[PDB]
Amino acid sequence: VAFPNQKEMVRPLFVFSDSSITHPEFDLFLRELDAEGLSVMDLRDVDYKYHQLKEMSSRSLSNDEVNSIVKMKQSLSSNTGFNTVLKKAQLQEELEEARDAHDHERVARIEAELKSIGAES
């Protein structure tokens, strides 16, 4: 984002407040736009944004989109008990595959990884 008077800034989402914009805030924003020499968004563009938000909020996600969002949050997932159990089970399956294939090098790494992940309370 960017203030008109100030410069560009990268901000996270939680900084924004759910409270509505007050009259002096919008007036100060208009004064900053006039100082920089900019205009306000057109009413046609305002309606286009409103229709875009309503369509996006009322949209129905597809299976592929839902899986992509789930994979994205799984990449963001630091830890979750169900997911840790599933990962440990998958690692155990990979470990038995490596043991049955007589691969003495992979199995040590999988055992070390399981030891690091494990030791619950």
Partner: peptide
């Protein structure tokens, strides 16, 4: 081409909960 009023901006309020 008309300027946007306060109510027009209020129609497109997108809260932090809505962002999440």
């Amino acid at each position: 081409s008309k300027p946007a009023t306060l109510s027009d901006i209020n129609k497109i309020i997108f809260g932090r909960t809505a962002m999440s």
